[PDB]
Structures are given as structure tokens and as C-alpha cells.
Design a protein around this ligand. Structure first.
Ligand SMILES: O=CCc1ccccc1
Ligand SMILES: O=CCc1ccccc1
Ligand SMILES: [Cu+2]
Ligand SMILES: [Cu+2]
Lengths: 620, 620
């Protein structure tokens, strides 16, 4: 009955049927995106109106369409033809990946480049990469992928060990034409293999690791109802899944006494971009919008018990559409479990003689995805004490190049001849806030140092200051780790027992933001990534910091256009967009396969409760 | 057999006997500090000499002494009379905590202050607080404690709920006189209790938490030999314990194939300071040097199974000296165990079809201490992938005051009438480096942004730079989160297979450093806390960033004095001192007992290995 339930195979089948009946899904059509829409703002609601948004591609060259259907009522709500040269191309189709290597294999320019390097075309893999927007005027309005080559010596060889530098091709995946083949000269193709399951590389496997057993004899402390509604240690939420964003959290709330108190209406990773910092023509165009261009949900791994998720695990198996509108299940794509998290609170008091210790635990909701060479785990945490946290785990294989003979300022050496171009992984968390309801505001809080003098004669005093962000034009904020800068989301109309507005404090990691020159294509296309914090007024159609269509789309949409409306955000329905990321200068230890590195953020209650919310936790 | 073994009860007994016999331990002498000295630098096979360092206090007013004895040979190596007005007072005696309350209880000024507030003197606890150095000339050379009052309504009451503001006393604990009683006026004593085990306050305890069972059916994967030598997953080290510093790690090394490779010679928390930022004269003097003034090792808790440490735990029970030279065991004061740490590495490769996943693990060495109101957990972590990490967990009860009517810029309100003065907790990690041996150097590494132009036509390039710190005068460094600043410790004479000096990279959290005015007493006595990273040349007697005798020292001791020697640190035996801390603006949620908050740092290998060091981890 819940409007936030996961999409079912039946719903997706029904969308297909509605589209078919309306003449919108003939044999030339492909679904590039399909997702359920969140219920509109309105508590005087339906029984249910389940609506789905669809991006429909046409393989014959006709204009694509954005369509919204109501599966409940069996109707097309709206359908509009898209001008992709203006508003952006549709996401890359999983079927268009194949096209590049296949087309190149019969291109005479490409064959000549491979022959120049004495490479067998049968052994040359081509990475099908998003093209972005640069100086190639003929690409405007066309679906283009750029190809980079890697040699695979045998079917189970890691081709990343053998990059073919000095060569790139551009391909029109609809007309099936190789538009350009650029060869800037031969580089040695690194010979050393990177096969991390090969005994000659691993050496004998450790026999020293004894088992660690994590079990729950009485089962988990959380409940799952209606498919995806979670209740755990006073927390309440709905776990959704979208093919673009991946796992999405809905209606995060906390049961404080008799009241269910909202905290966050919707939490997601609304975009993630991987800009490369190697100025070589072979890769200077390279920027992966994993979420916006590729759709990270689509590549969600099936998570194996014991391996990926250890302990008492409850799985969700979200359903997505394939390119033809048939449902496909991602079996065990989402892990849910609780884990011990050390000490929660502890004090040994001399005067009272009481020794008090309590243990902490956290609820985990996670999935793991794969985009070519690299892999990411997305983890959401709920803690006993009201803390909410997100963590990204970056791993996989590094994207490689040749390592230039006389060294490089933009590439590190991993192995003889083998380079790793510098890059970042930058995430945007979209937090549709609801601190005790929708009337919220944001303050920027800085530590304030004080000068020794009257009123502070010993020079020990320090303080803090808070600045309300009142309009969107003043709500684009940068980190300041030196002054302990955080952002507090409060409800000015809901006060704690001490008569202060209830709040939550956002703690960022203060990692560097986008490094690219402000005049670059990527700085315009990934404008969100250039600042740590954005606050907007809630609107239905403002979903991604990069807009609806990121593929081969210039600047013009996304957060910079939303912010321009300069709307009132002081005690209103607001959305926080937090930019955070990793800056990766790859090290030798990252090769042949990369150990997990992490980045994230957290929010802690800040006068939200009238006292510690974990006084009722037992010793046990 | 190892010179790094923990001190035994018998060794401490032998020290007592040596002192006694030399006439240095009469009935008016008190041991304020006692600890085993590390072995001197190298070199000659064995012929080992267990030496103990002792600070001897005299309760009749005579000059204290610093004494070094040899337990091995039963001799006194040296005994020096200390001039405490010059070089500082000895650490606070636990037996002196008692004295303050007792002396004040018969002081007429004190009793008048309590009578005015209608407080039963039998119910008034007095916190024995370190005095520091301020404007009071008569205190120079004297051994002073300052007292702040808290009301305890009954034996098991939390006195921290009932601070007595507007009142402070100064006492000479040797001559046993109250030197000052300052009453700046009456404040209401907050009436609400803060008894977190009172069902009235906690409410009904949760019945919703199901057990999490952590077991190792075949035992742990680490071995303990010689009492405190640990081998685990290629790591090697010795776990020491000092009454001042607490847990100390020795000889941290990694066995890389054939070689045992050193990384860190000695790791410790060599100071920790808690400066208060309330300019009220009642508290403006207040600065806890938990390590330097109080000695955090002596207040280490006994850790219970299931409560403090969960899973398969191996305990150490370190022995210390009491005030009279008797050995006292701290039963189960140190927890050692390994825990699962999620995914180590993961890649699902399209081209090879190989799906690869490995689990991560960390070795944990921890202890927990109590300093009056607040408590700290100290955690050292060793990871499979070579990473070394420290984490401090702060909890306990907040140190309280009145909340002024009208509010405050330096105090937050926890409960009606109840305040919590702003403060910091700032740590110093002393890392005696030994990256592949003692010939080390430190580089500051910043991200470098590049401008769009020739050689960077698309404006996507970014890079980094490294600056060698070559002498101590240039080795006092600041954080810069905005440019991703880290510090690399390398060995210029030990190169990896790519001909690069092996290295470890220090990742800081970039929290604010000491906030007090630069001209303040605390800024002078805790100068280490004003900068994030210091590098010194190793020397035997440079142990603490605040000097040997922190209590009532006038300023400038320790790191600023060391740095002043301006010694060569470029390819030399060097020591890294990292400052990191929490800036605490206490929240309503911190009351009546505080949920754990954390801070720390880590070091990651940086071209230390020739490839990932975890390729030989099995699939589990
Ligand atoms: O997005 C990276 C290119 C790629 C695509 C498919 C398999 C391996 C690598
Ligand atoms: O150092 C903090 C003051 C204190 C000392 C001993 C017991 C309770 C409180
Ligand atoms: Cu990376
Ligand atoms: Cu604190």
C-alpha cells in the first residue's frame, strides 16, 4: 500500500504495455532510462498514483522522447520530443558499448594504427567512453562514444595492464560511423601482466587468517515490512532503488517517545563525476559521470553472502527495465544488516562509584557497482545516537596509460612503462531535508577566535558564529576546515525543551573540490563539484545537480540554473546538495588491483533531542 | 628476553628497594612518576640494562628529585635535585585529589561561600584541578591545586549536574593552606539530576536489541610472545605501557617477503591538553594536561568482556608503581584483538569475466582512561594493506558550569540553568619514524591546480608538489585541507622497484588547532597544539612536546625549545609530532552522559611496496 514501495516486475511490464499501446515503443525504440517517480507534495493523498518516468531512444535516428506514465491508471501523462543538441543526449545504452570495438575493428585508420604497434586486432579491447562536449562541431546532436584501447593477451587477461597510448577514436553509435581516429604516436604497450588471481603474481596464499564469525542467534534487530520499509532502534525509513541514483533513502525519521519525528525526506547520491587530470589529447576529454551518463544502479553487483556482506544479512533484489522495457531483477543487489560499533558511552565516576558502559551499533544499507575499470560501494549508516552517515568505498582497477619516458606531472608510474593518470571521484549528496517537518533553514557555523583583552584578559576565550542562509543566491558555500566550518539544518518553528530550534549538524571531510580550471568544459558541466555546499528551495523537477540529460550536454542546466531563481530558503522546504570527493594520485600499492579508499560525510543531532537519546540502551 | 618487555611487578619492587636503601624513599617521599626507559640507540648485540626513571616528591617541603636506577645491576645511576620554579612541578599525586576538598572544608571563607548558597559542606565535592601559571607571584615554586565545587545530593549522585558557579579556591597542597577563596557571586545550583542509571531518567530500557555474536572458532590470527610481542598478518611490534603516555607501540615493522622492514620505531600519544574557552575568572585558568599533568596511564580502566571489548580478546595487564613504590597491576588494562573491516578490494571485470572480492581486517590495540569528568578510549589499528591508524574516542560526562541568564558566547546550555563551557581536546602523536631504517625525511605534499593554456588547452590538468623539510626551523607545518595537504615520510636511500624512495603518507583530519590567543599562557605552555605537524631530530631526552615537568611550568618547554636547535632533518633519524583534536561546543545530546565522538589520523604506504601487499589474501 506504501507509495514508496520498490518498483515491481509487474509495474515495469505494465509501463512497457502502456507505452506500446500509445504507439511510443515500437521496434526501433529503446528505453535508456526508467524509474518510478516520488509522490508529489501532498498529505491529502490518493489511494495511490504510481507514476514512471521514461527516456526513450530511437535507433533509427528519430528524436528521443521523455515520457511520464501512470501505471495505476494506464495512461500516458505526458510525452515530449527532445532536442538533444540543446538539452542533452540520453544516457549511454548498455548495448552501444559493444558497437565501438566492433566498428573500429573494420576501420582502415584503426587497423593501420594497430598494425603500427604490431597489435592483433582480435586481442584489442576498446573502452567505450562518454564523449563530453569539446571542439568537434560535427558531434552536436549526435550520439558519440570515444574509444581507448587495451590489449588482452588471452580471454582472462586483465587488459588494463596493457594500455595502448597515443591512440583514440570517436564513433557515432547510431549511424555506425567512425568519425575520427587520432594517432599521436606509438608508445610501448606495457608488457607486465596485472592478473591478481595468478599464483606467479600473488605468491602462495596466506594460511595465517583465522575465521571471524559474526552471527545473530535471535536474528536481526530490524524489521522489514511492505517490501522495503525499515524499522530499527527507533529509526524509520523506506529503502528505494533507482537505476540512475542507485539506493535512495526515503522518509528517514526517528521515534522520540510517542512522536515519529522526520529528519530527512529523501537522501541520495544525485551525481558522481570522475574527471581526469592528464592534459594528453588521448585522455584530456575524459570525464565519467558515473551516475548521470552511465546510470550506476544498472551496474549494481549481485552481492554474495560471506564475501560482500558478512553477518546476518537481509537482501533486497530491486527490479529495473532492460532496453526493451522488460523487467530485470538485480538479485541480492542491496545488503541490509546491523553491526556492532564499539563503545557508545562510558564513564567511571570517582565520587559516585558508578562505572557505566554501553555499546554502539549501526544499521547498514549498501550496494556495490562497477563502471569499467573501477568499482564503488555505497554505504548508508544509521547510529543509535541519531547520527546519519554516508560512506563511499572506491576500489577496482585503476584506469591506465603509458608512463612517459621522462616522467610526468599528471601521471604516476605503477609498473615498468605503466602509467595512472591523476583524477578525482566527486560525489553530490542530495539531501531533501525535513528536520521535524518541512519548515527548515540552514546556518553556516564557524569557530570564532577571540583576541586577548578586556572581557578576555587571559586570552583563553573562543566562541562560534552562525549565519542563516536566507536566499539561494547566498547559499553556495565553501569548506573552511581551519575554522571548523559546518552547516546546521534547523526547524525555526520546532524547539527543544531549552527553547532552541531543533537541528542537525552536517560534518564534511573537507576534501579538495573540483581542481579543473574554472574555464574548462568539465568545470561548466560539473559546476556542482566546484563548491562544497548548495542549498535550494525544493522543486519537483530539480532532481540532479547536473540536470536530466548529462550525456554530451554543455552547461546550462543543473544547480547553477536552479540557484539563479534566488528563492526564499529561510524556514521553507529546502534541499541540501553536498559535494565531496577523493583526489587520487595513484600509488604503486593501487596496482594490480586497488585496496579500498573511502570518503563521505555525516550528520549529527544538534539540540534535536532534549537529552541523550540513548539513555534507554541496556547493558546486556 | 626482549628489552621492550613490559615492566614486571618484581622490577618495580626492586626499584623501590634500590631507592629505599639509598635513602631516597623516606616516609615523606612520594613517587609521582615511575617508568622504564627505552633502550638507547643500538647497537651491541645484547648486554642489556633495564633502567627506570623516577620522579620523587617530598611532602614535607624538601626539593623533589629525578632519579634513574638500574634494576639489572641494583644501582642508582643518578639523582638530581629539581628546582621546580625553573623546570616545573612534578605530576599531580592521586593522593592530592583528596586534599583540596578536605582543606577547604574547614576554611572560613569557603564555609561562608557554601553557607550563603545553603549548601551542606558534607555534600560538596571539590574537583582538584591543575593550576597552570598566571598572575599570582606567590605561586611560583609552590605546589598548587585549584578547586571547583559540585554538589552531590547522595552517595550515588552525579555531582556534575550540580556545579557551584561563581566560586573557586586555590590551595597549597604541601603547606596545606588555602591561599585564596574567590566568590564572584551566587549562581543558582542547577537542580535537575543527571543520573543516567535512574529509571526515572532513562525510561523503560529497550527490549529491541538482538544479540550480535562475534567469535573466532579457531582462535585469533595474531600471536603474543615474550609477554607483549605481537605478530599479525605480516606486522611485527611490541606493545609497551607507560604510566604517563599509556599504551606505546614499539618496533612497528612489516615483513615484505624475505625482509622485515621497519616503519615506525615508537608511536605514542605524548601529550593531550583540554583548554577551556570560558573567560569567567572562575574557569579562565582551566587547562588539563591529561597526559603531562595527570598521567593518563595510571587511571586506565579494567576492561570487561562483552562490555568494553567484544569478540576474541587477548588482554595485557600492565604493572605500575603506587606513590610508595609498590607494584600495582591494572587488570585487563589493554585489549588486543582483530576485527573484520568490510571489503579490502573488489573488481568485476567485463572483459576477463573474473569477479574478485577480498575482505579486510585490522589488528586493534586499545585502552580506556578516566580523567575526572571525562573518559577517553585510545585505539591503534594495523590494517592488512599496510595502513596504520590512531583513533581517540571521547566520552564521559561534560565538565559543567552555570548557564548565565542572558546566555553566553562561551558556554552552551545542557539542561535548565546548566552550562557546558566550550573547550578543546588536543592530542600530540609522537612518531619516532623508521621508514626502512632511520635515514628518513619529510615532504609536504600539496595538490597543485593548473591554469588553462598551452600544454593544458582543455584546462583539465592538475598536479601536485612536494617540499622537503630540511631543517627544524622550517619543520613547523600547518594544515591546508583546501589543497589536500599531507606529509610523506620517506627513506631517500631505500628505493622501490620503480627507483622511487619508499614512503608513508600521513593523512590528517584537519580539525582546528589551539584556538586561544597567541599571547595566552596556554598558547605558550601548549605551543605544540598551535600547529598541525612538527618534525624534530631524534634525541634521547626529547620525549614530550610539553617538556618533562608540565605542571605549573611557565611556558616554551618541549617542542619550541627542541625546534630552536635547528638541526638537520634531511635524511636523518627523525621524529614526527602530529597535533590533532576535537573542538567541543557541547550539545544537549551530550547530557547527562556523552555519546562517543572521535578524532585521529592515519598513515598509508606510498610506494613503500612494489605492488599491492595484499595479493596473497585468500578468497575466504
Ligand atoms: O567505462 C570504462 C570502459 C569499459 C567498459 C566496459 C568494460 C570495461 C571497460
Ligand atoms: O580532574 C577532574 C576533577 C576530578 C578528580 C577526581 C574525581 C572527580 C573529578
Ligand atoms: Cu581513483
Ligand atoms: Cu569535550
Amino acid at each position: 500500500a506504501s507509495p514508496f514501495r520498490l518498483a515491481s516486475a509487474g509495474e515495469i511490464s505494465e509501463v512497457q504495455g502502456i507505452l506500446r499501446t500509445a504507439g511510443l515503443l515500437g521496434p526501433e525504440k529503446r528505453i535508456a532510462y526508467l524509474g518510478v517517480l516520488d509522490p508529489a507534495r501532498g498529505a491529502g493523498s490518493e489511494a495511490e498514483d504510481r507514476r514512471f518516468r521514461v527516456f526513450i531512444h530511437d535507433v533509427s535516428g528519430a528524436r528521443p522522447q521523455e515520457v511520464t506514465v501512470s501505471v495505476t491508471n494506464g495512461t500516458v501523462i505526458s510525452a515530449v520530443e527532445l532536442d538533444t543538441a540543446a538539452t542533452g543526449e540520453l544516457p549511454v545504452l548498455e548495448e552501444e558499448f559493444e558497437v565501438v570495438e566492433q566498428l573500429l575493428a573494420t576501420d582502415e585508420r584503426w587497423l593501420k594504427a594497430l598494425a603500427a604497434r604490431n597489435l592483433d586486432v582480435s586481442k584489442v579491447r576498446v573502452a567505450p567512453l562518454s564523449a563530453g562536449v569539446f571542439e568537434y562541431a560535427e558531434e552536436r546532436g549526435r550520439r558519440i562514444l570515444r574509444g581507448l584501447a587495451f590489449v588482452q593477451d588471452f580471454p582472462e587477461d586483465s587488459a588494463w595492464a596493457h594500455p595502448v597510448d597515443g591512440l583514440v577514436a570517436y564513433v557515432d553509435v547510431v549511424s555506425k560511423e567512425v568519425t575520427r581516429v587520432i594517432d599521436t604516436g606509438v608508445f610501448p604497450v606495457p608488457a607486465e601482466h596485472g592478473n591478481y588471481t595468478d599464483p606467479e603474481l600473488t605468491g602462495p596464499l596466506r594460511t595465517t587468517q583465522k575465521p571471524i564469525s559474526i552471527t545473530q542467534p535471535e536474528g536481526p534487530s530490524f524489521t522489514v515490512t511492505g517490501g522495503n520499509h525499515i524499522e530499527w532502534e527507533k529509526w524509520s525509513l523506506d529503502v528505494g532503488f533507482d537505476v540512475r541514483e542507485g539506493v535512495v533513502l526515503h522518509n528517514i525519521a526517528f521515534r522520540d517517545g510517542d512522536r515519529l519525528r522526520p529528519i530527512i525526506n529523501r537522501a541520495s547520491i544525485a551525481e558522481m563525476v570522475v574527471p581526469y587530470g592528464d592534459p594528453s589529447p588521448i585522455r584530456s576529454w575524459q570525464n565519467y559521470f558515473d551516475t548521470g551518463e552511465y546510470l550506476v544502479g544498472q551496474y549494481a553487483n549481485s552481492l554474495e553472502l560471506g564475501c560482500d556482506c558478512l553477518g546476518d544479512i537481509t537482501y533486497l533484489s530491486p527490479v529495473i527495465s532492460d532496453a526493451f522495457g522488460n523487467p530485470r531483477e538485480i538479485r541480492n543487489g542491496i545488503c541490509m544488516h546491523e553491526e556492532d560499533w564499539g563503545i557508545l558511552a562510558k564513564h567511571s565516576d570517582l565520587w559516585s562509584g558508578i562505572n557505566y558502559t554501553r555499546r554502539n551499533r549501526r544499521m547498514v544499507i549498501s550496494f556495490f557497482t562497477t563502471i569499467g575499470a573501477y568499482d564503488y560501494g555505497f554505504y548508508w549508516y544509521l547510529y543509535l545516537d541519531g547520527t546519519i552517515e554516508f560512506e563511499a568505498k572506491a576500489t577496482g582497477v585503476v584506469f591506465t596509460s603509458a608512463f612517459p619516458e621522462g616522467g610526468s606531472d599528471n601521471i604516476s608510474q605503477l609498473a615498468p612503462g605503466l602509467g595512472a593518470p591523476f583524477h578525482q571521484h566527486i560525489f553530490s549528496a542530495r539531501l531533501d531535508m525535513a528536520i521535524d517537518g518541512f519548515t527548515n533553514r540552514v546556518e553556516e557555523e564557524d569557530v570564532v577566535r577571540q583576541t586577548m583583552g578586556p572581557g578576555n584578559e587571559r586570552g583563553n576565550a573562543f566562541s562560534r558564529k552562525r549565519t542563516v542562509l536566507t536566499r539561494e543566491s547566498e547559499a553556495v558555500r565553501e569548506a573552511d576546515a581551519r575554522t571548523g566550518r559546518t552547516w546546521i539544518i534547523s526547524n525555526p518553528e520546532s524547539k527543544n525543551r531549552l527553547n532552541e530550534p531543533v537541528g542537525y549538524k552536517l560534518h564534511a571531510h573537507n576534501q579538495p573540490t573540483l581542481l579543473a580550471d574554472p574555464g574548462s568544459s568539465i568545470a561548466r558541466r560539473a559546476a556542482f563539484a566546484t563548491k562544497d555546499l548548495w542549498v535550494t528551495r525544493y522543486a519537483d523537477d530539480e532532481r540532479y545537480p547536473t540536470g536530466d540529460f548529462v550525456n554530451q550536454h554543455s552547461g546550462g542546466a543543473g544547480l547553477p540554473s536552479y540557484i539563479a531563481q534566488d528563492r526564499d530558503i529561510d524556514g521553507q522546504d529546502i534541499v541540501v546538495w553536498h559535494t565531496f570527493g577523493l583526489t587520487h594520485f595513484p600509488r604503486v600499492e593501487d596496482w594490480p588491483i586497488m585496496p579500498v579508499d573511502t570518503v563521505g560525510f555525516k550528520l549529527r543531532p544538534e539540540g534535536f533531542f532534549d537529552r541523550s537519546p540513548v539513555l534507554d540502551v541496556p547493558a546486556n
